[PDB]
Structure 1
Amino acid sequence: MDDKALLVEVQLLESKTYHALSNLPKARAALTSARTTANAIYCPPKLQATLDMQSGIIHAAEEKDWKTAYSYFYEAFEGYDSIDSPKAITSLKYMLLCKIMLNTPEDVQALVSGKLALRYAGRQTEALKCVAQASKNRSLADFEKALTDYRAELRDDP
Structure 2
Amino acid sequence: LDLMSGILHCEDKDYKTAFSYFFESFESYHNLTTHNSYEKACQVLKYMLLSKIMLNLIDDVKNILNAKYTKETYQSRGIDAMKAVAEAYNNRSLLDFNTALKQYEKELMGDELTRSHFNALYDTLLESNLCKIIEPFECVEISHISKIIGLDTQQVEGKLSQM
Q: Does 1:110 align with 2:60?
A: no
Q: Which has the higher helix share?
A: 1
How far does residue 104 in structure 1 lie from its aligned partner after superposition?
1.7
Structure 1: any 5+ residue segments left out of the alignment? Answer: 1-50
> TM-score, length-normalised on structure 1?
0.62
What is the TM-score normalised by the length of structure 2? 0.60
Where in structure 2 are the equivalents of 1:1-158 lying within 5 Å?
51-63=1-13, 65-81=14-30, 82=33, 83-84=35-36, 85-116=38-69, 117-152=71-106, 153-157=108-112, 158=116
Equivalent-residue separation in structure 2 for 1:123 and 1:134 (angstroms): 15
- Residues 123, 141 of structure 1: alpha-carbon distance in 2 compared, 3 angstrom cutoff: closer
The count of corresponding residues between Structure 1 and Structure 2 is 107
The answer to which of 115-124 and 147-156 deviates more is 115-124
Distance 1:103 1:123 in 2: 19
Of all paired residues, the percent bearing the same amino acid is: 47
Cα distance between partner residues in 1 of 2:40 and 2:85: 22
Q: Once structures 1 and 2 are overlaid, which stretch shifts more, 133-142 or 114-123?
A: 114-123
C-alpha contact (below 8 Å) 1:109/1:129 kept by paired residues: yes
What's the offset of the Cα at 1:125? Answer: 1.6
Are the counterparts in 2 of residues 106 and 136 from structure 1 also a CA contact under 8 Å?
no
Which sections of structure 2, spanning at least 5 residues, go unmatched? 117-163
**Partner secondary structure for residue 91 of structure 1:** helix
Alpha-carbon distance in structure 2 between the residues aligned to 1:75 and 1:118: 14
| Larger RCO: 1 or 2 (CA < 8 Å, sep 6+) | 2
